[PDB]
Design a protein around this nucleic acid. Structure first.
Length: 739
RNA sequence: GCAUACGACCA
DNA sequence: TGGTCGTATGCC
């Protein structure tokens, strides 16, 4: 397959390198023939004679147009003639594009900021991560002793299919070395010997490689982890960094893991238990540092690091196939895709499709234009949830509401308010009209995407091969991720194919279909909807049973599916015996089997009493199973009364901006602001554990660091009341009554 | 983008 | 007793 592409400059000329793995052997293909370019839309053909002579200066070097080609391309569904201006080097375009753009016969320029390697991959039609080539994997970690990298790293731990080892400065896997220099040299020898394609880390982009470069510079080590002898190439991405290893794919899992799940804690043990359900030993850096001088508990830490290497490898085995599939589907390298945002992912996909279909790509918005489209966007339809628990309530939701709308109504800038067409669709309450005579750009690609996903699903059902089945699952989920990113692109501020009207029309169409479905389910099938959110609703019968529920629900489903247009379709996903809905996006429902699922309630909010969980679950389990609403309150009041005494024994907010920049001062911010005079260093993402003592004054005034939980009756009265006041009000029990 | 809670200030 | 503004955090 193809692993990555880059370019080096040889005698002022750019040479593309394609890293490949064919039949078990790493290979580098060189291309010296590709040339950067832009497109220029001119007042008249004549003007090229003046424009082709436009020159600039880069470093004392004159930059000239190498050659030109007149080309006919489609722009927003309409034909356009432009001039392709080629150049010698990628760096020449930034130097000369402004002068070309300023010239008076040049109406505009286009496609001037595409990075060279990506551009090469698109224009050649080359696709990374294709085929059945097997890629060797290697995971590693480092443990240091607690300014940055002043302390040495105590050990380095690596894991692969055959096992995990630890190279630190008395055990089969662990190797103990004389010094830190020897340990890093040994780790490098290990990586060179095994020669892996994928290097797996956890937060390696911003911790492990930076630390290693600092320690190598301090010890004068050439850390040539690359297959071309190169050192890791640091890169700046946003306010953070990414690290690349030439000839390999450095797979950092932290950016990927952040995008897949929404765990409150994102340390390796936390994600590992989320993904596999198994505990992971946790070792703090300070504990590891003490072992070196003492010599004791070396194995414990070496086991806490060995296990980190192993879990990093395991998470990498489980996450690499999905990213490889996304890479295949977007048409860019894994390194890029695994680190990129969904907006950029759609952009890369569309730019490839555009080059395939000879469509000229719109420019990224300028800063003024960016502000012009930064106005508020209308949200999805939500009904305030009916308070209290309900009986025999059923959940129905649309399949792919927004993609299905875009395909059914052909929503695209290409088709917006086009004149002279036989057929049109009209958006509700915003009135936009979309032509139905020819398929739009996005609607076309979206339709093919959904087609392919359906084909893959059927192939999944009919295959005997369990490996192929797992593979196709990955592929179809990748398609779902891309297809669902497409609506976001219509309203994406930085999008090239931005279309305000398309976005609002999609939202309006979604709301119309949802509310109309609810209207007819009540008016024509006698149903009450308890709660709804943008693409689905919880509704029920006043009196009926589970079998009744199902049989009756499918009548409405067929009726409405026959009336629903095209791909628009509603389905039955949830049977639930009783539901407790507290507010929008905050509910608890329990199923016929006895499982209960939580959304938005206090349980999953990071600010919460640790031990109030038992009574929270009991209140939900009594409310939802027993259905007795005084039982819930006599439970709450009995726990409160028993917490008076003779009860068996049983608060951190992150700072996002610096205290000088903070507009106000909250109780946790007063602690951090005071710490600045106390000096212990504070940074975005660190956590304020604070307490409030029983004393007169402002709440910022009385907030204290935590090291400076007693639960002696009053603690139970700190934020418990809000956590159940609305929950328990539905049943007539006031805040005052509970205490 | 929506949504929840309240912190801070002001009456 | 009632308001605005702003902060930390969860969803679809």
């Amino acid at each position: 397959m193809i692993l990555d592409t880059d370019y080096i400059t040889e005698d002022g000329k750019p040479v593309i390198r394609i890293f490949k793995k064919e039949n078990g052997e790493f290979k580098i293909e060189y291309d010296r023939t590709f040339e950067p370019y832009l497109y220029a839309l001119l007042k008249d053909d004549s003007a090229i004679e003046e424009v082709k002579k436009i020159t600039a200066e880069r470093h004392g070097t004159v930059v000239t147009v190498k050659r030109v080609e007149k080309v006919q391309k489609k722009f927003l569904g309409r034909p356009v003639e432009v001039w392709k201006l080629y150049f010698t080097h990628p760096q020449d375009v930034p130097a000369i594009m402004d002068k070309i753009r300023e010239h008076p016969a040049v109406i505009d320029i286009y496609e001037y900021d595409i990075p060279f390697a990506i551009r090469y991959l698109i224009d050649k039609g080359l696709v990374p991560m294709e085929g059945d080539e097997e890629l060797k994997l290697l995971a590693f970690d480092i443990e240091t002793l607690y300014e940055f990298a002043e302390g040495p790293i105590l050990m380095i731990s690596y894991a692969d299919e055959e096992g995990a080892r630890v190279i630190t400065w008395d055990l089969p896997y662990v190797d103990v070395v004389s010094t830190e220099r020897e340990m890093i040299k040994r780790f490098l020898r290990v990586v060179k010997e095994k020669d892996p394609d994928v290097l797996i880390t956890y937060d390696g982009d911003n911790f492990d490689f930076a630390y290693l470069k600092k320690r190598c510079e301090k010890l004068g080590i050439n850390f040539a982890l690359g297959r071309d002898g190169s050192e890791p190439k640091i890169q700046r991405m946003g306010d953070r960094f990414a690290v690349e290893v030439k000839g390999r794919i450095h797979f950092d899992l932290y950016p990927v893991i952040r995008r897949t799940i929404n765990l409150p804690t994102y340390t390796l043990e936390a994600v590992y238990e989320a993904v596999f359900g198994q505990p992971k030993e946790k070792v703090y850096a300070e504990e590891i540092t003490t072992a070196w001088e003492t010599g004791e508990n070396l194995e414990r830490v070496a086991r806490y690091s060995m296990e980190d290497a192993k879990v990093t490898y395991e998470l990498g085995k489980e996450f690499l196939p999905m990213e490889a599939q996304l890479s295949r589907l977007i048409g860019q390298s894994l390194w890029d895709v695994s680190r990129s945002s969904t907006g950029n992912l759609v952009e890369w996909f569309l730019l490839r499709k555009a080059y395939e279909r000879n469509e000229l790509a719109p420019n990224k918005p300028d800063e003024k234009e960016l502000a012009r489209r930064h106005q508020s966007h209308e949200g999805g339809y939500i009904k305030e949830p009916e308070r209290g628990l309900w009986e025999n309530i059923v959940y129905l939701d649309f399949r792919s509401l927004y993609p299905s709308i875009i395909i059914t109504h052909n929503v695209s800038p290409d088709t917006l308010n086009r004149e002279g067409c036989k057929e049109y669709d009209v958006a509700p309450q915003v009135g936009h009209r979309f032509c139905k005579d020819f398929p739009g750009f996005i609607p076309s690609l979206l339709g093919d995407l959904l087609e392919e996903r359906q084909k893959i699903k059927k192939r999944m059902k009919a295959t005997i091969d369990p490996i192929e089945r797992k593979l196709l699952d990955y592929r179809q989920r990748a398609i779902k991720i891309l297809a669902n990113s497409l609506y976001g692109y219509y309203g994406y501020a930085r999008a090239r194919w931005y279309c305000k009207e398309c976005a609002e029309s999609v939202i309006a169409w979604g709301r119309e279909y949802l509310t109309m479905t609810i209207k007819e389910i009540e008016e024509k099938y006698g149903f009450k909807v308890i709660y709804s959110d943008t693409d689905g609703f919880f509704a029920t019968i006043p009196g009926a049973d589970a079998e009744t529920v199902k049989k009756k629900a499918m009548e409405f489903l067929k009726y409405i599916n026959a009336k629903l247009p095209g791909a628009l379709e509603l389905e039955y996903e949830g049977f639930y015996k009783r539901g407790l809905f507290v507010t929008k996006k905050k509910y608890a429902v329990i199923d016929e089997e006895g499982k209960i699922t939580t959304r938005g309630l206090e349980i999953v909010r990071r600010d919460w009493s640790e031990i109030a969980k038992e009574t929270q679950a009991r209140v939900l389990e009594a409310l939802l199973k027993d259905g007795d609403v005084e039982k819930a309150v006599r439970i709450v009041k009995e726990v409160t009364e028993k917490l008076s005494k003779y009860e068996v024994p049983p608060i951190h907010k992150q700072i996002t901006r610096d205290l000088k920049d903070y507009k106000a001062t909250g109780p946790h911010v007063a602690v951090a602001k005071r710490l600045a005079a106390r000096g212990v260093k504070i940074r975005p993402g660190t956590v304020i554990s604070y307490i409030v003592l029983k004393g007169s004054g402002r709440i910022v005034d009385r907030a204290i660091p935590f090291d400076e939980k007693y639960d002696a009756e009053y603690y139970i009265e700190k934020q418990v009341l809000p956590a159940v006041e609305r929950i328990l009000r539905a049943f007539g029990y006031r805040k005052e009554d509970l205490r």
